[PDB]
From a paper:
The enzyme is weakly activated by forskolin, fully activated by the G protein Gαs subunit and is autoinhibited by the AC9 C-terminus. Here, we present the cryo-EM structures of AC9 in several distinct states: (i) AC9 bound to a nucleotide inhibitor MANT-GTP, (ii) bound to an artificial activator (DARPin C4) and MANT-GTP, (iii) bound to DARPin C4 and a nucleotide analogue ATPαS, (iv) bound to Gαs and MANT-GTP.
Using single-particle analysis of the complex we obtained the 3D reconstruction of AC9–C4–M (AC9–C4 complex in the presence of 0.5 mM MANT-GTP) at a resolution of 4.2 Å. The DARPin C4 binds to the C2a domain of AC9 at a site that partially overlaps with the Gαs-binding site. There is one major structural difference between the structure of AC9–C4–M and that of AC9–Gαs determined previously: DARPin C4 does not appear to stablise the occluded state, in which the C2b domain of AC9 displaces the nucleotide and forskolin from their binding sites at the C1a/C2a domain interface. In contrast, in the case of the DARPin C4-bound state, the full-length AC9 could be captured in a nucleotide-bound state. The binding of DARPin C4 to the C2a domain of AC9 leads to a small rearrangement of the C1a domain (RMSD ~1.2 Å), particularly prominent at the flexible “claw” region (β6α5β7β8) of C1a domain.
Author numbering:
A (entry chain A): 97 to 197, 217 to 262, 278 to 359, 384 to 552, 566 to 574, 780 to 939, 976 to 1250
B (entry chain B): 9 to 136
Amino acid sequence: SVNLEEACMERCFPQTQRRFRYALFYIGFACLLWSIYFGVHMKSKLIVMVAPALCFLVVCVGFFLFTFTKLYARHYVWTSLVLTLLVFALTLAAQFQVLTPCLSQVGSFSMCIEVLFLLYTVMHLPLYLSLILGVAYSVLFETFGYHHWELLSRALLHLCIHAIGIHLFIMSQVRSRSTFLKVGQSIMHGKDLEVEKALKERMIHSVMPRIIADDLMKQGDEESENSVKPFKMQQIEEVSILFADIVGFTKMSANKSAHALVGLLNDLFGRFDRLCEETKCEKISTLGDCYYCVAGCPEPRADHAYCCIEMGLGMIRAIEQFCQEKKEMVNMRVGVHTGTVLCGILGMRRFKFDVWSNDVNLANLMEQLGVAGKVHISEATAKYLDDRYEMEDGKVTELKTYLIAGQFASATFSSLLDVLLSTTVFLILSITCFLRYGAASTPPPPAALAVFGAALLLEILSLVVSVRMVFFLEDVMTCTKRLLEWIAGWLPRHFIGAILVSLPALAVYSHVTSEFETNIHSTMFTGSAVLTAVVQYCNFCQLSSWMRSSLATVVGAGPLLLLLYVSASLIGQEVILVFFLLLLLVWFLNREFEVSYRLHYHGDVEADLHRTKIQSMRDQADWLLRNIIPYHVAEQLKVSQTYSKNHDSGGVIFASIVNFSEFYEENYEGGKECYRVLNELIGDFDELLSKPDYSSIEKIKTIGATYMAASGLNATQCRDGSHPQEHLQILFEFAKEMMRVVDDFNNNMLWFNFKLRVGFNHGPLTAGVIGTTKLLYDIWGDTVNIASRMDTTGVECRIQVSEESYRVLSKMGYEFDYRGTVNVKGKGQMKTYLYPKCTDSG
Amino acid sequence: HHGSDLGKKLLEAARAGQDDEVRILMANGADVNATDDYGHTPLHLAAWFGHLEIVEVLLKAGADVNAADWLGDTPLHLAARIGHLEIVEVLLKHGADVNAQDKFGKTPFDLAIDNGNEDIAEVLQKAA
């Protein structure tokens, strides 16, 4: 902790220099009032004192104007060492020249105590070192006060004053450590929280376009952005729905490094983003061997079709410039189609921004009817072609279409600590106060033992209060704890402490009630002790400042202005001066320390604030990650540039709402709430996904109203405790269950039963991740488009299944009824089965 | 509510038409205007199932006349899209609204024409 706790002092400097500057000033004021005392009232018979006084004054102010120098910024330690040794010598010398009978030993003791403080508080000196200097000074001064009780009484006063010394030290030291450290953590959180804001914004905008995330990053409706720990959908007309599929993709993806195709594809799509940004068009999604943007959705553009089509043409140049670059000649079919579309978001898991209309499927079809290299546009597109290009009445070679090729220290630890302090030092103080008794063998005065017992009672009970609010041993009863401590709040603590630290002054007052001044040794003594006790009024710092200090003034000194009325004569004058100045100290010292505690409490409030705020942002953004990408794979771009992997067996299932397309009827303006209902069921599906018996299942995305699912992919750790072929089984089980779910859902949907057709395939695949400065996940291989075509040609409420998947599940035990061996694009005939057995009458 | 299952079982009663169970739950002080997760009211579950006697025992229990589901459609919209004129009459006597609409923007009257349920579309031509 060395290099760090260097910068610590390097930061906490200017306060230290301020303390030094004030201590210097006070030393000035003290020596100077001594001088004027000695130069007017008494001691007009010598210069042995006052010239030393003024010399000390001037060397002090020399230090004072010094403190602004540059070859001091690293020497405040040694500067304090110099100054303190100087004042040590000054006090001891201005003392030794006594003990003939005209300068009281109490005055000497004021000097002793005060210099001992300003050694402790302000010097910022090492603990061990300030300690040894304190004790050396102490013993040497009490010896120079010697040139069988009274001596050790004064020695005990020295001991207690060193106690409060060290405690005050370590308190101020750990406090101005802790505040430094907390401010360090606070600035760490400042930067770290700006960072997590940046990352969370990245992920968000890589799942929704500009306007929508800008709109929902101000959270004007605070209830919507609670799903991020909901959303609104809008229908827009006159759009441009572009498409693309990698023609002959399976062929140009026959044998790759499971990374090669990944990378080159990332490249192409980054290209296409670079294109849309210039055409200001909103890319939307990438279906495997496909891709597509849209236009005119957030802002229906006057030439949205134009940006769209010319963007596509630019994609033609891009694809050809890569085909003749990496030497793989596969361009892409293109279908363009306009009309209206309701966009929005659906789902809560893996949910993304998306669009829905007839026009959607229409443009997809016109893609399928598009020629590799050119676009099969529609008349709804041609309505403002403005005939500036290569227009050709492109029709099926087998409706209104065209082909275009272009053109420590806890604020309750402090309590027990400083109450330990007050009690032990009051203890040894009253030890002294008794120890005066060698003349009256048994201690006569009644008020003495009365207040002694009373203080013992109070202190021990409150000390126990604190030790059980700390260490929680629970001797007797526990509910009583939460009840009575509850009282000890901001003010009750005020007054208990007021009494609790006032009591040592009354302790010393108990012994003085007697007539004593006839002996002036007793008065000298009790003066010394009362100034000790008044110095004890520094310790309890978790209390107020003005109040505790004014209590110091009054109930320490006032009664000595009272014994001013025992008229032991002008020792009164010297005492009122010493207390005037000592009280000046305790005032400004104390207020400074309360500043220190105030600031530490503050600088723990604020660090806790940023602590919980970073926790908010962290849960939010990390869960947003788990929204887009699964965690196991989430490692590989967190740690590297990308990720890819091959799995040779993973089940994929679609599920659409076919009879939605009918109950789609747009008699309701926008049909929005129908999609709300769809979303309802989509949620009801996420609800499944969060089930741990649904662990190995991963929704891939939600297309249109469809539902892409996969499995057998995340848990790579093949443990002895499973049969690896289980994943398809739990998968299809989940499938049947969600099938029952849509039924349950339909028990509620008024007079409509929304039915779903589901397809299937299992086998090889490629997991991959696309976006950078964005992000997108996806899968390829045979299995994806295989099952895609399956549920594209499936029968509802009857789970179509691929032949070999049928086989593996039959050998799992599940019941199937044959459906037919229907031709598969690029594959020929394939045996299909349905899982539902006798579900219908046929 | 405070244990709103007496109202949930009320919903299932109004739906499936458990006649005596209606009387039982209303004796149990069941929540007369308790609703499902989808805003449906006992009138919604009733019109769906055509238990007019149970509609009337619920009117003894005393639900709302113009309550709509979370899908904004009132059981008037339902019955329009259903075709039970006799069940429609009791709510016009209970004072249903004629010029309102669901969250779908058409007066429930046209919902009779949705199925071409001219039986009730006629009834809705009478009041205004």
